[PDB]
């Protein structure tokens, strides 16, 4: 659901859509081993629509 | 001008990619750039060191050593060879007294 900017290392501020945040959560779940779960984890987001 | 060279070794010496406004590249050239400004000072220094090279202000000491005041918009190079002339001046005779007058 959640939508927000991401402030990229280069200096760009990405205000962008939610499916970029689906992006971050696959990015987190894939390094994650198996059996665990993203539930309270950080998605080091700067900030939330 | 070896103010990179002597500088703590952890430190950057280039502005890193990551960021074209890096602060630490910024303040590091900025004293680089008074370091080799002051080198470039100094070694243009020696110039006034010498009766030869010497210009305005040290010059006018070089006269004031020698007895010979700078005249009104006199340049350096005629008034330093009007010092020379006066070291060297011939006296007591015929010739010397033409060449006075």
Not at chain 1, 19 to 47: D, N, Q
Not at chain 2, 22 to 48: G, H, R, T, Y
Not at chain 2, 50 to 77: A, C, M, N, P, Q
């Amino acid at each position: 659901a959640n939508s927000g900017t991401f402030v990229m290392d280069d200096g760009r501020k990405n205000h962008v859509p939610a499916y970029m945040v689906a992006v971050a959560l696959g990015g987190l779940a894939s390094g994650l081993e198996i059996g665990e779960s993203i539930t309270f984890k950080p998605l080091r987001v700067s900030s939330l629509d | 001008a070896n103010f990179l060279k002597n500088l703590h070794p952890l430190l950057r010496r280039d502005r890193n990619k990551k960021d074209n406004q890096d602060p630490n590249f910024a303040l590091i050239d900025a004293l680089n750039e008074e370091m080799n400004q002051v080198e470039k000072d100094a070694i243009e220094s020696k110039l006034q060191s010498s009766l030869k090279t010497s210009t305005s202000e040290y010059l006018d000491k070089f006269g004031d050593w020698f007895g010979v005041y700078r005249k009104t918009d006199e340049k350096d190079d005629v008034y330093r060879a009007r010092i020379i002339k006066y070291l060297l001046l011939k006296r007591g005779t015929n010739n010397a007294i033409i060449d006075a007058i």
